Design a protein around this ligand. Structure first.
Ligand SMILES: [Ca+2]
Ligand SMILES: [Ca+2]
Ligand SMILES: [Ca+2]
Ligand SMILES: [Ca+2]
Ligand SMILES: [Ca+2]
Ligand SMILES: [Ca+2]
Lengths: 125, 125
């Protein structure tokens, strides 16, 4: 069959607050974001297409995914390698190299270590 | 010429406290470590043979050299890459990888970041 407005019997036949739209012989559901199926029964797996980059963990949530980034990465898809050289950390005209969740200073001659702190022209004795 | 004991005239003809040994027609100097030359005049350059490894700075000193190591290296010749994994820093059965003046933790599934602190099996909600 059958001629009836399924949207007017009582409870909403569409799950997860979808909008019920009557048709002749059936009905249709206008689903909210993140829900699928004839009656919006399914919570879509937003992680199914592997959106999280750089070995991030994908969290399948309500109408969205969340990425948990590997250290040193950021962004919605963990697509951004954080720039550790942004604060220009190298002393004495050292050159900063960005790495993963860290930086490297390329010190000029006569200077060492991590931040080029040690003056070796200073070894005056 | 000439017949004379150069070691008995007065001052020591050998520099840098070398031992004066008389010979017929001359004399010879028995130099202390780090000195060379007929009269021990020269302070040997202990850095001449490039003893300092891994881009270390060589200091030419009295009868010895000293190496100034690049960060993460140690030893007389800076030949030792310091083992940062010695203290077993990785939490939750993470695997430690030794690097230069740093370490990397290879976390098992469900754990992140530097020391594998973050439990993601814990994202219970
Ligand atoms: Ca109908
Ligand atoms: Ca979902
Ligand atoms: Ca970076
Ligand atoms: Ca003599
Ligand atoms: Ca010397
Ligand atoms: Ca190391």
């Amino acid at each position: 069959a059958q001629d009836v407005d399924e949207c007017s019997l009582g409870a909403n036949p569409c799950e997860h607050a979808g909008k019920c739209i009557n048709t002749l012989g059936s009905f249709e559901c206008q689903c909210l974001q993140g829900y699928t199926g004839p009656r919006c029964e399914i919570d879509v797996n937003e992680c199914v297409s592997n959106p999280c980059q750089n070995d991030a963990a994908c969290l399948d949530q309500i109408g969205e995914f969340q990425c948990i980034c590997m250290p040193g990465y950021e962004g919605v898809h963990c697509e951004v390698n954080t720039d550790e050289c942004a604060s220009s950390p190298c002393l004495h005209n050292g050159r900063c190299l960005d790495k993963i969740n860290e930086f490297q200073c390329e010190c000029p001659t006569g200077f060492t270590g991590h931040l080029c702190q040690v003056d070796l022209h200073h070894i005056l004795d």
